[PDB]
Amino acid sequence: QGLAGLRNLGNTCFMNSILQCLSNTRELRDYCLQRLYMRDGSNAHTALVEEFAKLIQTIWTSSPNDVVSPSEFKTQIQRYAPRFVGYNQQDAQEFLRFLLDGLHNEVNRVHLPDDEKGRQMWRKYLEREDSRIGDLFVGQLKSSLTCTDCGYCSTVFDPFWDLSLPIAVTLMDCMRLFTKEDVLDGDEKPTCCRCRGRKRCIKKFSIQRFPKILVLHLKRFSESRIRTSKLTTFVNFPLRDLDLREFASENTNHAVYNLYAVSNHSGTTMGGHYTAYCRSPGTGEWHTFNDSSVTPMSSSQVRTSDAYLLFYELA
């Protein structure tokens, strides 16, 4: 059933919101429930993956309106990320990043055409970082830097486990802003390695490998002389058929995603509340998780201006 709520241990709604999103990440949940993790590290430590998996196993063997305590779990993520030792308000995406890095580390199994360069860079990355967690989240960006003087296009390939998107509004607009030709001029002029001097260049991202689970993180922040504030712009994201083919490095590479979870924030950059909306893998039905409270909702209520992290699964 999987509708247990999580106890708020003291400003830990950022943590509970992300844990529900992961609980309803189908392949990640299954990995824990079949305890494939015991089968599978960067150090001697396994307690973070153990408590994370026991938390998921407890949520999925629980009855509605059970409340589960993530206390043991918190003790372990703190050791990876001391930022979380206290009970202060925190950012869900920062939490997600340290949590997945920790899980990953504990079960870590460890002149050419551009195409070929990318494929070789990828292998180099997997030679160092290769886990079931990565399997799910990891993708590869291509970045093309072209000198406007000599026309050389320098290409590099960076792994990613999520994308942090500027807000342009539609989600696609934000992806186009992320992937646009960026003109690097004036104080940002790069050195062209062929010209061997500073030149106006154009830099452009495309997606060389798409991940099985695509986490999109909306940069709801604005820096000004007058104030740092949160952007509460409504960003309209689809429930189904998010089609990212126009962003792919390769023409055909099809990449269509359906939403299954959202972490919501309400407030300013300095404080606020988190909840999650998540689609159950089993039933397809959506529920609102606001700590210990879990209520059904319709997918028509899922898009709101409070969405901050979007969890999509590849179709």
Binding site: D91, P159, P166, D187, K189, R220, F221, E223, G267
Partner: protein, 76 residues
Amino acid sequence: MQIFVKTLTGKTITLEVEPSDTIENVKAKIQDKEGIPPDQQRLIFAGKQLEDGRTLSDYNIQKESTLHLVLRLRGG
């Protein structure tokens, strides 16, 4: 070597660095450029958040790699 930062609006800026430069040194350069205090910056690369006290080479950050700058929406 040069690396890039994709900033809050999606603007990209260019930093000159060495692999042995500390993440704090990088945030100091971002601040010079964008005026965001370093304590407010979070930099993400290959899914890791870069931490003060580490260097670029600990994260295998290569020439022309891009770091992704985000702030925080604190909540709880």
